[PDB]
Amino acid sequence: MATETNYPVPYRSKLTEPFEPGQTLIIKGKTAEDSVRFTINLHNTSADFSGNDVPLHISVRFDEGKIVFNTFSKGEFGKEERKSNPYKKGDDIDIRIRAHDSKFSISVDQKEVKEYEHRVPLSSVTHFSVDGDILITYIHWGGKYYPVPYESGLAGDGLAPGKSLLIFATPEKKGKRFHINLLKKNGDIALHFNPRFDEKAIVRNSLISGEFGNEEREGKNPLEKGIGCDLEFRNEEYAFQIYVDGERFATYAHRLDPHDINGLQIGGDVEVTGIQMV
Numbered sequence: 001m002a003t004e005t006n007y008p009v010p011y012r013s014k015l016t017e018p019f020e021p022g023q024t025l026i027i028k029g030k031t032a033e034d035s036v037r038f039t040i041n042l043h044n045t046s047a048d049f050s051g052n053d054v055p056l057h058i059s060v061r062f063d064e065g066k067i068v069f070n071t072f073s074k075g076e077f078g079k080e081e082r083k084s085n086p087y088k089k090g091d092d093i094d095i096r097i098r099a100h101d102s103k104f105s106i107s108v109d110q111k112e113v114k115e116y117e118h119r120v121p122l123s124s125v126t127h128f129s130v131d132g133d134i135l136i137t138y139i140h141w142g143g144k145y146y147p148v149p150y151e152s153g154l155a156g157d158g159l160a161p162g163k164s165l166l167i168f169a170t171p172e173k174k175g176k177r178f179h180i181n182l183l184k185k186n187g188d189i190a191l192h193f194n195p196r197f198d199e200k201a202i203v204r205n206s207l208i209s210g211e212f213g214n215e216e217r218e219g220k221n222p223l224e225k226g227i228g229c230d231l232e233f234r235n236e237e238y239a240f241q242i243y244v245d246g247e248r249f250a251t252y253a254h255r256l257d258p259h260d261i262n263g264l265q266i267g268g269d270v271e272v273t274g275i276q277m278v
């Protein structure tokens with residue numbers, strides 16, 4: 001227990017549906033300088049058991065300096081699959097678990113570190129718990145396999161001021177550039193967000209009636225290939241506020257009425273693992 005941000009340990013939570021392929025569990029938190037272990041368990045129960053079937057047990061140990069991935073079933077654990085723990089007592093943590101048909105995929109600071117092969121049915125994760133020497137600051141889950149080129153309507157009300165669009169993506173490793181488009185009903189692009197890795201810039205621009213306007217670009221490109229990031233398109237009243245990886249990357253004064261931005265478009269060298277309106 002420390003500064004009440006919320007999220008008390010032990011933190012248990014019930015899943016709406018079972019944990020399907022494409023969906024991701026994301027657990028951020030801060031660690032004290034006296035922390036030895038915390039744990040993440042994708043389990044089932046009975047309503048809530050407290051020791052029955054755990055398809056994916058992650059134990060992060062600062063004493064042993066390794067992340068331990070195991071699976072408790074039929075009363076036992078099995079062969080520990082170990083892996084070097086890149087964390088140091090102190091600093092934040094960023095564990096993100098993605099289910100697939102074949103296996104779990106666990107990634108640290110947005111960098112894949114472990115491909116845990118499914119040992120008992122994934123269909124048995126109905127709960128997840130987080131426990132131990134850790135302060136939890138962010139636990140989110142959801143998502144699906146997002147096909148790219150992506151295209152889809154946004155909600156109904158669309159993205160209007162007071163709403164952010166939250167996109168969790170990962171630029172492809174040998175990819176030169178990708179784009180995201182927030183769209184208006186008539187066709188126009190409200191904001192064209194276009195990280196170009198070749199030009200080492202993130203070009204921002206609007207497409208009005210067939211023709212692209214000026215093109216705003218100042219900004220150290222923060223994305224890195226093969227690494228995943230948290231793109232956030234925060235629609236304020238006078239500008240979008242673009243957030244990359246927790247911090248404001250750039251603002252973009254509206255060149256079009258931010259009301260009724262009801263379409264989304266993601267192209268290029270990128271994998272999309274989460275979309276959500278907020």
Ligand SMILES: OC[C@H]1O[C@@H](O)[C@H](O)[C@@H](O)[C@@H]1O
Pocket residue numbers: 192194203204205212213214215
């Ligand atoms: O090709 C059209 C558009 O593509 C993007 O890469 C640029 O950022 C836009 O300003 C350009 O007009």
